Design a binder for this molecule. Structure first.
Ligand SMILES: CC(=O)NCCNC(=O)C[N+](=O)[O-]
Ligand SMILES: CC(=O)NCCNC(=O)C[N+](=O)[O-]
Lengths: 828, 828
């Protein structure tokens, strides 16, 4: 190919009885006609291809006041809609194009709405009724700096728009291009002007190449293609819908009449454009005609396609015209023709040209070697199509297009709760439809995650099959710094991490690495496979602290690595007792080796202490409990200050039972905690000095995150944190968790996530103050985690959903476009 | 320069108080304002730059019916006019562009006339009111096959049109391009829409960069430039008016408001376009602003030209805006700005920007390093200018333009006697004006001859100085096969060819070559310098036939070579007696050597015969004279049958005097011819056999033209013509000249030219039947010849006037454009 072939990487279209590409396929393939009488709500030649309506537009979506919407050419309104839908169609997130060199090239040859406005004034009229802003408004809304223009060559405007975009891309003037056109028939005055010309079929049909040929029927609509160089297309890994090899535009020059087309000029345009692409009469699979159905214009266009592509061909050449389905869209005729050919090329199937029975007696189809496509068939032999579009003032354009070279989240967002509902439902319908079933649930979710604006109102639905997700959608249609708090002893439960292991490789890999180290450490000095202990439901081994502490650490670090791989990065971390070892390690203070040495030792040295230990949760203030225990320092102390009326008392089971009895006798809650020992009491004094010797052998680095101490109840710096005195004291004195939550909030934490099993810490964080428990109980682990990272994403946290789909080899696929909240806007 | 620089090789403009480029210079240089109140004949913000009128158009010139003219957007009408004037301005003859790849690119952003039509229907409305035909109609009229489009970027449309033409030329899509725009303010509805926007100065002035800045004043008009690649420009030897180095167009992207311009986007457009041309802040001589005079838009455009061209410059940069003279032409604003800069570049002088007194307090001119041009000065240092044009919808365009790297006929033609008159007068005014005086009479005539359509009504004026030609113009404002008949004995006069020798080198050269041979031939066997004999007025030597015959031959062959060098090529030739030797030689039958040998011999062998010879011209039929001379064959015969009542009797002076007496006695004309001998009588019998021996030594080739015999009275073929019998008989028997004219006419000759001195043969050709004598008497030879070739050109003969100007080194120079016969066309 001479010059850089251009990639159609997307498209949109509003056509008669075809609100999108899918519907346009249904219509064309069913061999259906959207030509009707003029709707009663239009003014009134009595025939035409009309949109279901031209008055409705989501002005708010594009930041347009109702009064500006009223004053705006519905052509401007529609092209905005089509622009957004073309980008979404291609997979590009429009915000990423802000300040890029995106070009806008639109064929517009009519200003009907300006006629309605003028035959009946505020600052709005100027921009609303001026044709230039059909392109310019697209450019202003996307914030694009590329060239932005409307072109008027009449009934060839929309294809010439495409040509100027291809050349624009070739010259590097623009990196991406929106091209096509728009034509709305919303004034009788233009209906009467084209009627008086003599161009209109009294029967209201384009009899394209048929012998009934007696004029064209009018149609209205718009189409846009998304254009990138083929090079840049493949590089950026974008859905390639088809490729423009060569575009050309000439003029009739010296025709018989101004309005008569010239056979010479059409041959000269064909010969040139094909030679630039290097395509012979035999390599062209199908030609999408102008084919207006005019007595004069049909034979000339036939004769010209004959001479160039009829000679040098054994088979007849298939020809058709979307003007037989939707009428003559004039300025938008060519982008209509191109968008058909592009669908015929992706589907690899031809569709019928309607209104053909007997051939025109001025068009020998046999001699010229062209056959009119009359049925939906498959397309034989890559596949190559040609598109013609001619203007009455003589300016012809042709384009040569070739075919292209366990638990899932679906994320949905909108600019409005009502849009989000509508967005959810539109995806359910599509997902559960034939066309959505050529796409896997995997592929869909990946496409939802990467290729779609995350608007201000967001939901996540989850499911294991399509039926489950579609069900969740239908149901849906009816911040600060991120703080992590790592769970302590009490939060453990048999099964811990089995369901997360089977589900997520990133958890399983990290869980295997942390268990591999721990199985060596514990295997050497046991209280030997920790995974088997944790994952077995028939086992109470985890209630024994020589297993509980390494188990909580293993589950918490796996979970942290899984969260981190989804972009859920804590900035500030705190831990309840053994929680702090997981927290401190992932803040990079201890290597995995030292962390495993530290936690396993702690587990063991405490495990080997005698019975006679107890802890009780008590509904009382710190000040109350200090008064009740003053003088008993040697037998009992405060194990935890968890809330302002939430402290755990720990020590001799004798004096604990007494304390539990006292607060119950005051009509307070008092729950006996299931634990082997009196943690954070004087009963820990025996193991302390042995614990101090294990930590004195470890290497403490400065943290990569802000650590808040469960001992200090405040932000803890490295010098304190990287000493032996801290970790012995940590093992012995009260967990100041309530105070830790305060210090986190004080330092700017707005979102709190419990990193551990259950929601013990989340409850205590709630009592102290946005709190979510990463893995709440009474539901499968994958469900409870996805739920939790869901709330975070909905509240505005930038979850990296892309990274959730590293496990699978998910491919981008076309999705429904934004469910516009259209409302009526019109003159009075 | 990155991409192929483009040559502006021509331009036209209709602007307020500036009907052409010359007037636009006068206005700009006088520092004049064409802003006025709305004329009373317009509908009605109360201020504007208006054309003297927008209703008048020569529809017939462009083959448009008055009814189609009525229905036509005056924008369409004006751009047709401007198209023809742009081509004529560049020197290109529009008929030569028929079927070439000429591109038409026009900025048009308004359809006012469609508003007038619709607020009040035939087949005419469709093409007349559709914007696309502003470009397409140009394309149809010129018969051009290049791309033909209107573009709408709003108030930047006309410069973007230029850009798309430059890129079109660079890609070889078009070989020549018409680019610019048009904007006519002929509807109140658009006046009220821009008023309500808030953009309009209540004072009705663009106070460009002045502190009174309070909006723009509207203006109307159009401009076109003629564009060719610089390569093709120099090659084809075309007037280069200036050269576009680099054109760029972008869009504001994310501006504060849709309609607010962005400083960022303007910097990005400037940086790019200049870098493509390779021009530094210091190489730019002047910048032609957008400079609307808006409070918001002036500072932003200033700030952006500052940042790019203000830094890196020791001197301030001169800036101005034609919007201070003619108002804001909107869609035609940019081509207005470009056409100024192009005139500043040819004149090598700056002009003032009006309405500047005190600088805007939001525009530090010192800091930004821009000074507003306030006076007409010279332009210091080749010269380089920049043109800005911005649209309200954000689409900016900039262009970088550099400065360029004895008796005369004036030919004038028109499509109408009234146009020819008007055409003649418009050239007289211009010729005799200062601007026409920078062009020599030579240069003018060459330009008239080569660079101007030869329309169906044509005149030639002649003169020796400008005063004489301008006088001839003012006076002017108050076919078949071409046959040559070569003069015989009787037509000679003393001076013969002296005035033609001094005048035309091609005659003089050929006269010297024919005399050089003859002076040898005659010098050897004399009856010795033939030029001296012929050119002397005090000499009767030429009445002696030994001189007369070579003299007629020498003058006739020189004249034939002069005629041939002007493209006045005879297809059929005849000669009276010695005439036939010149005729036969130039038909290539005899070489110059043999022709000179033949004629000189003939001259001599006849010269040496005795006295007693006479000839008399007689007003009588051949049949009458045969009856009167029957029986006297030995003493007298018919010397010539010249007309149907015109024969010359020749022989013994005794019997001739008798014949002269007889016809006088019958009351008939009878003129005694002044001759030495009785030519074509029995008195020639003595020299015949000696004549036969000279011709028998000569080489006769087949003629390259049709020869008609004065002996045969019919078309003579080579076998007869290339024999000795023919030329002896030719010398002896009657000249059947009347019959020769008949045979010429019979074989299709419609134009007859006497090749010889005087008009003896022309009279006889008139009597027999378009007849012109190449050199009639009683007037200087150059005058009488130019007159004669004038009549031929007027009657439709393709005279090659180009070839008349090989003598001088004449250069093409700009001329007045076609004097359109404008009449009113409008709606009712
Ligand atoms: C002379 C006449 O009525 N020609 C109509 C044929 N023109 C065409 O087919 C191009 N077009 O206006 O869509
Ligand atoms: C916001 C506003 O009224 N802006 C006017 C400034 N715009 C310009 O100068 C570009 N133009 O419409 O010729």
């Amino acid at each position: 190919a001479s010059d850089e072939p251009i990639a159609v990487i997307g498209l949109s279209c509003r056509l008669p009885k075809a609100s999108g590409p899918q519907e346009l396929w249904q219509l064309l393939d069913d061999g259906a006609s959207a030509v009707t009488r003029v709707p009663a709500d239009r003014e009134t030649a009595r025939w035409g291809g009309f949109l279901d309506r031209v008055d409705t537009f989501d002005a708010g979506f594009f930041g347009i006041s109702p009064r500006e919407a009223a004053a705006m050419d519905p052509q401007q309104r529609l092209v905005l809609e089509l622009s957004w839908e073309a980008l979404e169609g291609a997979g590009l997130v429009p915000a990423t194009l802000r300040d890029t060199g995106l070009g806008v090239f639109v064929g517009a040859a009519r200003d009907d709405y300006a006629t309605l406005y003028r035959r009946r004034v505020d600052h709005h009229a100027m921009t609303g009724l001026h044709r230039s802003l059909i392109a310019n408004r697209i450019s202003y809304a996307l914030g694009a700096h590329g060239p932005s223009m409307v072109v008027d060559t009449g009934q060839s405007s929309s294809l010439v728009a495409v040509h100027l975009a291809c050349e624009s891309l070739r010259r590097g003037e623009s990196d991406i291009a929106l091209a096509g056109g728009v034509n709305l028939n919303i004034a009788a005055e233009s209906a009467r002007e084209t009627a008086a010309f003599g161009g209109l079929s009294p029967d209201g049909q384009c009899f394209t190449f048929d012998a009934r040929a007696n004029g064209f029927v009018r149609g209205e609509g718009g189409g846009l293609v998304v254009l990138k160089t083929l090079r840049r297309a493949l590089a950026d890994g974008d859905l390639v819908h088809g490729v423009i090899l060569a575009s050309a535009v000439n003029n009739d020059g010296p025709s018989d009449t101004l309005t008569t087309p010239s056979r010479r000029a059409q041959e000269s345009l064909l010969t040139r454009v094909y030679r630039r692409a290097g395509v012979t009469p035999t390599e062209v699979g199908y030609v999408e005609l102008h084919g207006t159905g005019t007595k004069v214009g049909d034979p000339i266009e036939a004769a010209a396609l004959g001479a160039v592509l009829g000679t040098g061909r054994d088979t007849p050449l298939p020809v058709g015209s979307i003007k037989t389905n939707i009428g003559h869209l004039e300025g938008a005729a060519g982008i209509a023709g191109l968008i058909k050919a592009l669908l015929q090329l992706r589907r690899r199937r031809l569709v019928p040209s309607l209104n053909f029975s007997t051939p025109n007696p001025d068009i020998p189809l046999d001699a010229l070697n062209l056959r009119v496509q009359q049925e939906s068939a498959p397309w034989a032999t890559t596949l190559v199509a040609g598109v013609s579009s001619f203007g009455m003032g003589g300016t012809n354009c042709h384009v040569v297009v070739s075919a292209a070279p366990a638990l899932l989240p679906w994320v949905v967002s909108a600019r409005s709760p009502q849009a989000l509902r509508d967005q959810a439902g539109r995806l359910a319908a599509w997902a559960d439809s034939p066309a959505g079933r050529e796409a896997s649930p995997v592929d869909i979710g990946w496409s939802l995650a990467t290729s779609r604006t995350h608007f201000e109102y967001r939901a996540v639905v989850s499911g294991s099959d399509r039926d489950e997700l579609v069900a969740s959608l239908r149901a849906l249609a009816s911040g600060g710094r991120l703080g992590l708090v790592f769970s302590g002893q009490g939060s453990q439960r048999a099964g811990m991490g089995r369901e997360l292991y089977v589900a997520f490789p990133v958890f399983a890999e990290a869980f295997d690495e942390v268990c591999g180290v721990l199985d060596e450490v514990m295997g050497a000095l046991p209280p030997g496979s920790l995974r088997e202990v944790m994952f077995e439901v028939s086992s109470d081994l985890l209630d024994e602290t020589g297993f509980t502490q390494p188990a909580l650490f293993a589950f918490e670090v796996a979970l942290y690595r899984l969260l981190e791989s989804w972009g859920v990065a804590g900035e500030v971390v705190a831990g309840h007792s053994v929680g702090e070892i997981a927290a401190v390690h992932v803040a990079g203070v201890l290597s995995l080796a030292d962390a495993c040495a530290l936690v396993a030792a702690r587990g063991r040295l405490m495990q080997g202490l005698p019975s006679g230990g107890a802890m009780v949760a008590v509904e009382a203030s710190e000040e109350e409990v200090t008064a009740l225990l003053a003088g008993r320092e040697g037998e009992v102390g405060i194990g935890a200050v968890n809330g302002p009326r939430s402290v755990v008392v720990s020590g001799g089971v004798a004096v604990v039972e007494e304390v539990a009895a006292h607060f119950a006798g005051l009509g307070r809650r008092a729950r006996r905690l299931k634990v082997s020992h009196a943690f954070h009491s004087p009963l820990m004094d025996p193991m302390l000095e042995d614990f101090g010797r294990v930590v004195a052998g470890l290497s403490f680095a400065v943290p990569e995150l802000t650590v808040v101490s469960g001992l200090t109840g405040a932000v803890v710096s490295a010098d304190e944190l990287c000493s032996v005195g801290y970790w012995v004291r940590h093992a012995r004195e009260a967990v100041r968790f309530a105070d830790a939550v305060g210090a986190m909030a004080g330092v700017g934490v707005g979102r709190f996530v419990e990193v551990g099993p259950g929601g013990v810490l989340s409850a205590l964080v709630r009592e102290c103050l946005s709190v979510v428990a990463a893995v709440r109980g009474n539901r499968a682990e994958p469900v409870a985690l996805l739920s939790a990272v869901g709330e975070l994403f909905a509240d505005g946290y930038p979850v990296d959903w892309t990274a959730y789909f590293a496990g699978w080899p998910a491919a981008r696929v076309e999705l429904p476009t934004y469910a516009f909240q259209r409302s009526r806007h019109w003159l009075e």
